[PDB]
Amino acid sequence: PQITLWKRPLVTIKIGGQLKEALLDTGADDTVLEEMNLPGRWKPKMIGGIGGFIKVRQYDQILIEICGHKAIGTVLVGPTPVNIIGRNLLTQIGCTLNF
């Protein structure tokens, strides 16, 4: 669909069988979700934001459905203030900016 920006671009995602709400975030290189149990191996990583760095768990090749669109890619899990969908997955669902 076409999503305006008068409100936060929040959508329902499905990951690990669980439904959650996430922010479509064109300023995020990567997808970062709040703490949750995800099956499969993971490796620790660091990511930096406006306020500094945090420690995250990196899950590769994770299936995630975003507003009805399937993606399979990297999902970071950690103390992010909000679930964010970043460009690594926004590209997979065909998302562009338009004005």
Site residues for ligand XVY per CB under 6 A: 23, 25, 27-30, 32, 47-50, 52-53, 80-82, 84, 86
Taking the complex as a whole, how short is the minimal distance between the CB of residue 89 and its own copies, in angstroms?
Answer: 9
25 is catalytic: yes
Q: How many whole angstroms separate alpha carbon 68 and alpha carbon 55?
A: 30
Direct distance between the N- and C-terminal alpha carbons of the chain, in angstroms, rounded to an integer: 15
**Residue 71: its H or E element:** strand 69-77
Query: Which of its own copies, ligand XVY, none is residue 3 near (CB under 5 to 8 Å by kind)?
Result: its own copies
Taking the complex as a whole, how short is the minimal distance between the CB of residue 78 and its own copies, in angstroms?
Answer: 9
Residue 57 DSSP SS3: strand
The catalytic site residues sit at 25
